[PDB]
Design a protein around this ligand. Sequence first.
Ligand SMILES: *[C@H]1OC[C@@H](O[C@@H]2OC[C@@H](O)[C@H](O)[C@H]2O)[C@H](O)[C@H]1F
Length: 185
Amino acid sequence: ASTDYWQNWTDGGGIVNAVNGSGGNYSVNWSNTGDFVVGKGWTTGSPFRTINYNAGVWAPNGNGYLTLYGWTRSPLIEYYVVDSWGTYRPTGTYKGTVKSDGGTYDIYTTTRYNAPSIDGDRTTFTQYWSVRQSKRPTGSNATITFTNHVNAWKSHGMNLGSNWAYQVMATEGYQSSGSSNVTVW
Ligand SMILES: *[C@H]1OC[C@@H](O[C@@H]2OC[C@@H](O)[C@H](O)[C@H]2O)[C@H](O)[C@H]1F
């Protein structure tokens, strides 16, 4: 499918060279940053969407995540499906696991306090996570069957909002440096 959304947010720290490439391709060069999220996807997320991607380049030099990323409103929730990471594997309150697309993911929930959100300014909100137990190899055509995660989260009381916001395959970095090149479809 064709992506119709370009995500490029940075809290202003360090250098973030985000390139809006052709089709569903994008690349990022970052160094000594604060928090940032870059990626391509869809303006309106869907719980039945199947995301395809190929990370030709995944070279984080510190804390960085290669992950499906999106938000919902009512209630406000930031969710993730992390396939790979840099030096830090994200974790939180363990809820269980889900097998999908050849890998096993741990399910976690965390909370952000007085943090920036899609609604601007700052607020408190919950984060839903699906983190692969081991890093998924990159450079290959990978698939993320989001329906499997959504259903798994539901059985653990993790329900998403009724108002769906953007949904993208992104690169998030936090106080680190690195490079990534990803194609989404
Ligand atoms: C999850 O990722 C980064 C950040 O989310 C950003 O908040 C501001 C908004 O304008 C951007 O589109 C979002 O990506 C959030 O604080 C964190 F929990």
